[PDB]
Amino acid sequence: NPKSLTRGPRDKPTPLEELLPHAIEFINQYYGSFKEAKIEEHLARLEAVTKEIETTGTYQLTLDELIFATKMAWRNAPRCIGRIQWSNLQVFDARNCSTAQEMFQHICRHILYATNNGNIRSAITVFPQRSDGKHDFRLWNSQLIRYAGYQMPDGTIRGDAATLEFTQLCIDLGWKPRYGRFDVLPLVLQADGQDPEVFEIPPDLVLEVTMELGLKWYALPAVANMLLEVGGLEFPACPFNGWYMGTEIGVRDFCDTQDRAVTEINVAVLHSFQKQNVTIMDHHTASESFMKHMQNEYVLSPFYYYQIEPWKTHIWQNEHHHH
Numbered sequence: 001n002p003k004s005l006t007r008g009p010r011d012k013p014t015p016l017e018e019l020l021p022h023a024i025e026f027i028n029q030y031y032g033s034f035k036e037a038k039i040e041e042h043l044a045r046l047e048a049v050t051k052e053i054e055t056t057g058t059y060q061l062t063l064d065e066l067i068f069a070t071k072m073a074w075r076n077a078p079r080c081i082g083r084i085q086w087s088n089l090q091v092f093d094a095r096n097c098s099t100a101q102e103m104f105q106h107i108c109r110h111i112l113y114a115t116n117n118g119n120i121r122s123a124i125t126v127f128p129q130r131s132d133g134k135h136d137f138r139l140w141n142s143q144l145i146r147y148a149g150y151q152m153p154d155g156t157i158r159g160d161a162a163t164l165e166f167t168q169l170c171i172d173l174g175w176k177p178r179y180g181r182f183d184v185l186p187l188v189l190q191a192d193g194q195d196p197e198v199f200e201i202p203p204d205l206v207l208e209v210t211m212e213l214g215l216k217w218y219a220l221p222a223v224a225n226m227l228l229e230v231g232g233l234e235f236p237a238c239p240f241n242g243w244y245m246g247t248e249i250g251v252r253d254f255c256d257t258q259d260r261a262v263t264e265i266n267v268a269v270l271h272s273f274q275k276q277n278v279t280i281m282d283h284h285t286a287s288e289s290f291m292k293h294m295q296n297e298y299v300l301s302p303f304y305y306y307q308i309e310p311w312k313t314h315i316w317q318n319e320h321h322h323h
């Protein structure tokens with residue numbers, strides 16, 4: 001019975017008999033948060049939602065339903081440690097986005113809001129929902145901000161190892177590669193199912209913490225490649241962020257070997273972020289964010305799914321050669 005954590009592509013609208021039960025169930029969860037209140041409201045919404053699905057083949061969530069969904073999907077994230085304070089999420093509604101250029105601006109706003117000069121704020125930007133599956137909005141990046149990974153003659157790394165495929169893809173799409181250890185990758189944005197466009201991220205928007213010893217690391221951990229599922233609807237483009245734990249900062253840029261044995265700690269990170277006043281999940285933050293979460297108080301659906309890397313499934317039109 002274990003379920004797949006991946007939700008792949010489609011090439012035709014979700015059939016009605018499949019969509020309705022899911023929509024109906026979401027509307028129930030949504031109105032369920034309200035105990036005995038809003039029963040007539042609940043029924044009026046089902047009628048409206050059903051009417052829409054039967055006439056248009058789909059339906060639109062209300063801003064409040066969307067907000068509830070992004071938070072419930074966060075709450076339902078099994079491995080997420082930050083889900084403990086799921087109410088602390090800022091939602092940016094970009095469901096009326098049409099072009100990659102507009103996606104770029106929305107992402108710039110997201111990065112700008114979330115970074116907040118170091119006082120990290122959790123946010124998610126929701127782009128248009130999947131229609132027929134041929135007009136998907138997708139961010140090809142794994143994260144909004146990430147360093148490039150360059151292959152070396154001897155088989156070693158220079159940059160972030162985890163971005164080898166993507167880094168190469170950027171170069172193939174026209175992007176000019178500098179060969180440093182900390183090159184922020186550009187945004188590869190796909191709008192309405194079209195070929196992706198490359199956009200350099202304005203340097204000012206990228207806040208970095210200085211760890212020669214020789215190291216830096218961006219302050220904003222933002223997942224750009226997941227799919228939000230809610231009531232049968234799928235959102236292939238919905239970048240979100242939180243703040244680092246401190247343990248994980250992928251310094252896989254290494255020969256860094258520079259007790260028992262496996263004693264390479266995560267100390268200078270904990271302190272460097274704190275002294276540069278950038279939110280990290282230390283005890284203070286865990287306690288404070290839980291407090292903020294508690295003050296707001298006064299299969300699994302919705303859910304964040306993984307996807308098949310877009311370059312592996314994209315039906316190229318013509319643009320940018322050596323795809």
Ligand code: HEM
Nearest residue numbers: 074077078079080081082122124240241242243244281304
């Ligand atoms: C507030 C700060 C946050 C912290 C400290 C946090 C922490 C974590 C950690 C440690 C993981 C596991 C390792 C990894 O996959 O990177 C994780 C995974 C994940 N987080 Fe967060 N997170 C935060 C905010 C968010 C937000 C705002 C969302 C979405 C609205 C979210 C959604 C997820 C998802 C979907 C995963 C993938 C793994 C899974 O769900 O099982 N997180 N998070």
